[PDB]
Amino acid sequence: RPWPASLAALALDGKLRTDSNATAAASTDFGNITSALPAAVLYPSSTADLVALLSAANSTPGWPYTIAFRGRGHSLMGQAFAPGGVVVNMASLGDAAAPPRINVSADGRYVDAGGEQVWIDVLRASLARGVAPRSWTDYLYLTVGGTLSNAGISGQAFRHGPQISNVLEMDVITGHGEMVTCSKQLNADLFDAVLGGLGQFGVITRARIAVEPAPARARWVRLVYTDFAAFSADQERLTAPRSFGPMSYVEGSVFVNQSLATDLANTGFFTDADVARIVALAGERNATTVYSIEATLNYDNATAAAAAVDQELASVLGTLSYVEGFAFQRDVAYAAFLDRVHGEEVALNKLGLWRVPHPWLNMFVPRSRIADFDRGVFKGILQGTDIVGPLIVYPLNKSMWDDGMSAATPSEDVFYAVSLLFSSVAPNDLARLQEQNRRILRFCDLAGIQYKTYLARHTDRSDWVRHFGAAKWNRFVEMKNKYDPKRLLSPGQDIFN
Ligand SMILES: *[C]C1=C([C])[C]=C2N=[C@@]3(/C([C]/[C]=N/C4=C5N=[C][N]C5=N[C]=N4)=[C]/[C])C(=O)[N]C(=O)N=C3N([C][C]([O])[C]([O])[C]([O])[C]OP([O])(=O)OP([O])(=O)O[C][C]3O[C](N4[C]=NC5=C4N=[C]N=C5[N])[C]([O])[C]3[O])C2=[C]1
Ligand SMILES: *[C@@H]1O[C@H](CO)[C@@H](O[C@@H]2O[C@H](CO)[C@@H](O)[C@H](O)[C@H]2NC(C)=O)[C@H](O)[C@H]1NC(C)=O
Ligand SMILES: *[C@@H]1O[C@H](CO)[C@@H](O[C@@H]2O[C@H](CO)[C@@H](O)[C@H](O)[C@H]2NC(C)=O)[C@H](O)[C@H]1NC(C)=O
Ligand SMILES: *[C@@H]1O[C@H](CO)[C@@H](O[C@@H]2O[C@H](CO)[C@@H](O)[C@H](O)[C@H]2NC(C)=O)[C@H](O)[C@H]1NC(C)=O
Ligand SMILES: *[C@@H]1O[C@H](CO)[C@@H](O)[C@H](O)[C@H]1NC(C)=O
Ligand SMILES: *[C@@H]1O[C@H](CO)[C@@H](O)[C@H](O)[C@H]1NC(C)=O
Incomplete structure (x- = not known):
């Protein structure tokens, strides 16, 4: 019932909307087959706002709101919905012109991109520095965090692997509301879980993407x-x-x-x-x-x-x-x-x-x-x-x-x-x-x-177990217990919801 100060501050600043216009826009996706109205939509202006939301949820006994992270909403069967919950309008993290949400490395070996950024913009920013990601998706108007939560494939994946095989590190805010930087050398368990993790363990706020010199x-x-x-x-x-x-x-x-x-x-x-x-x-x-x-x-x-x-x-x-x-x-x-x-x-x-x-x-x-x-x-x-x-x-x-x-x-x-x-x-x-x-x-x-x-979401537990494979499934569950104990994240996948 009571609201943590940082959470109330979000509503006070008009970042938490409950109007029909806001909820409706976050109730449909590209699939145009299923729809679900959220109770509210959050328009974060910084990663701190996300920490506030997730921290509140983690520290509030009885918190009843599932949370989804809407990128461009290209999901096909409601994977980005939060039925009666809170949908985070990720694009809001990029409303500010500064600081930039996309930074090509000084040495041109990689590009840092906010999880909300769309690949078309990642491409433009990279080319401006004579470089570009090595693995793509057929369509560029998708977010970095979105494709990485699935796999991200196209005609280059046969030699470079999917987009999840081309990430050096990431900043992730877990279901606990904790900001964690992860990679193969640090918090690798979270790193591996999030990649292709279907938004079940936390929100990717930054992804370090490998690049190669840009062809003309x-x-x-x-x-x-x-x-x-x-x-x-x-x-x-x-x-x-x-x-x-x-x-x-x-x-x-x-x-x-x-x-x-x-x-x-x-x-x-x-x-x-x-x-x-x-x-x-x-x-x-x-x-x-x-x-x-x-x-x-x-x-x-x-x-x-x-x-x-x-x-x-x-x-x-x-x-x-x-x-x-x-x-x-x-x-x-x-x-x-x-x-x-x-x-x-x-x-x-x-x-x-x-x-x-x-x-x-x-x-x-x-x-x-x-x-x-x-x-x-x-x-x-x-x-x-x-x-x-x-x-x-x-x-x-x-x-x-x-x-x-x-x-x-x-x-x-x-x-x-x-x-x-x-x-x-x-x-x-x-x-x-x-x-x-x-x-x-x-x-x-x-x-x-x-x-x-x-890109499909199953609606039966036995189907998800067979999907990942029994042994791999247990690992998925272990990561769920560690990072999203309350099972609030991306309920639209219908795995733990
Ligand atoms: C819509 C769409 C399109 C249009 C496209 C695409 N693409 C792709 C595929 C393919 C296709 N192709 C095509 C073509 N060709 C020629 N022509 C044509 N047309 C059309 N199409 C599929 C099938 C590619 O390419 N690849 C891949 O791989 N994929 C794709 N797709 C799909 C995608 O990827 C998906 O959708 C994803 O999801 C992404 O998106 P976005 O929007 O970004 O997102 P969303 O939906 O919103 O969400 C999802 C999920 O996740 C999560 N999240 C988000 N964000 C985040 C997260 N988590 C964490 N962190 C962060 N940041 C959420 O919550 C949910 O659950 C396509 C499509
Ligand atoms: C891109 O680089 C800029 C600096 O060149 C980073 O800007 C800082 O961003 C944090 C939060 O993201 C702010 O608290 C700081 O005040 C910013 N400092 C500057 C220099 O403005 C930015 O975070 C980087 N983003 C990426 C793509 O990783
Ligand atoms: C391939 O499809 C075409 C039509 O798209 C088929 O051609 C039609 O065949 C019927 C019956 O033989 C004729 O009455 C029509 O006048 C034809 N229309 C066209 C486009 O000329 C064709 O038979 C199909 N071929 C195969 C191998 O299935
Ligand atoms: C050209 O292709 C068509 C389609 O593959 C052949 O017709 C098929 O013939 C078999 C056996 O007679 C039937 O089971 C199929 O139903 C037929 N196709 C359909 C669905 O109409 C046809 O024989 C081929 N032409 C030749 C003889 O070279
Ligand atoms: C499907 O799209 C049409 C038009 O874009 C819209 O009127 C309808 O509400 C949508 N339905 C769903 C389930 O998204
Ligand atoms: C390749 O050539 C085109 C046309 O001359 C030019 O616009 C582009 O900047 C070049 N690529 C590089 C090295 O940026």
Whole structure:
């Protein structure tokens, strides 16, 4: 009942809001499928405000408010909600122009970024110093603390590992309200727990991100296949350890035949002439699906850079088996490539097709069963439907993941990131997509495929235990008991709430 002085001070300064405008904005997310109103929203102006909130919660017998840390709210199923609790509007930590919330190291070996900062700003600040993070996410308008609480993957993860494998240290305020700086050498238990920890142990206020000298441009290429075996074999060849090959980025896409021409055109990569040739190829092979590897080779402004890239690319391509003559090239500034999805957002939003339900299906599928997944899903379940949204598929190397961290991955040395990014655009098409997702998961369970979901929150304890693995689960729980004893943090994950 009584309020600690530092907590009341937050309300007095207008940082704790309970108005419908504040609570409503913090009640929905990108998923646009689930929603939950919090009792209040906190707009912290410094990390001290966060210490005050968490300290109050930890020292107040009977504290009944769960606490969530909202970054950009790109969660899909309410992971950033605090039902009847307090949602922290993390962005507020960056309202002040000084002191800066992003500082590139004096020696240019790393960049310190506030947990609330979005990667697009981290990128700009880094480039201003001639450097840039090594591992990214496909979309840059996500927060550092947000992607780090999951894993943070993209086409560079095969060689640099996810974003959680590229963090030197962090400042974290635990459920106890204590500010702790952690790394592999200090408070490593908290360090490993928080990375991929789904916001269960504390709030990341600062993350030290590893960087590399910034490349100036990216030779961007797409290779087309009608044969999945060749497609996957080539992705594995390009991402296999040698130390890794030349490619800086490697992803893949699945195009179902029904809407082939339209989807290829909507990639913003192919010309109408390219599209016509690919459509013709599909008909010739009588394919129900077309596959495309997407890769890049980063290079700088050196006078001989462009020519070197042409030779390097020619060599790499010579080792592949895409359909003869179906290699397509583009050349753009590094930043433009990295922020490519923002353009897709702008276009979709104008059409009112961005802010719609997103029943996205994301999972890691062991290499040994990816061909079965292709048969049962791409060539099976998905056939006959009108797909809206990209179907992304690409291999990852387990060697670049730290299994000591909270993030869960399949046991195999190589596993695929499979992201079926369905957009519910048609009238009331959501129910159909949700059922289709359950069917896909059912197919995998019955086939005995040992996949791991990503960005999904389970609603049954047995599912979370299987997710992390029993032994790893006990470790997760031990860290929960040590850092969030009252089980108040990020209740939307539905692990301890
Ligand atoms: C929305 C979204 C988008 C748009 C994107 C993305 N991305 C990603 C993926 C992929 C995708 N892709 C795509 C594409 N391509 C081409 N085209 C296209 N389109 C679309 N898309 C997924 C699937 C990438 O890339 N990668 C990854 O990995 N991921 C991603 N994503 C997802 C994310 O990451 C998530 O969402 C996260 O979460 C982040 O976000 P944010 O917003 O930042 O956050 P939130 O939601 O708010 O939250 C979450 C959680 O956590 C926690 N926290 C926060 N913060 C913090 C924390 N803790 C501690 N500390 C701190 N600081 C909370 O509480 C919760 O629980 C995507 C998406
Ligand atoms: C970035 O560097 C600045 C200094 O160059 C840091 O600024 C200090 O920030 C703390 C709280 O974050 C304040 O109490 C100090 O008054 C600030 N001092 C200065 C020099 O203004 C800032 O913390 C750093 N942030 C990052 C990205 O780690
Ligand atoms: C790939 O999809 C196209 C349509 O997107 C199919 O072509 C249609 O086929 C029906 C029945 O054969 C014809 O009546 C239509 O006139 C065709 N439309 C087009 C686009 O020309 C094609 O059959 C599909 N191919 C495969 C292998 O599934
Ligand atoms: C072109 O591809 C289509 C689709 O793979 C072939 O038609 C399939 O034929 C099998 C066996 O006859 C059926 O089980 C499928 O249902 C058919 N596809 C669908 C869903 O319509 C077709 O035979 C191929 N053309 C040839 C003979 O080369
Ligand atoms: C979904 O988004 C629409 C429009 O953006 C909004 O009217 C609706 O309240 C949202 N529903 C949920 C569950 O977020
Ligand atoms: C690379 O060259 C472009 C155009 O000349 C320039 O804008 C950019 O700053 C250069 N990259 C570096 C070294 O910052």
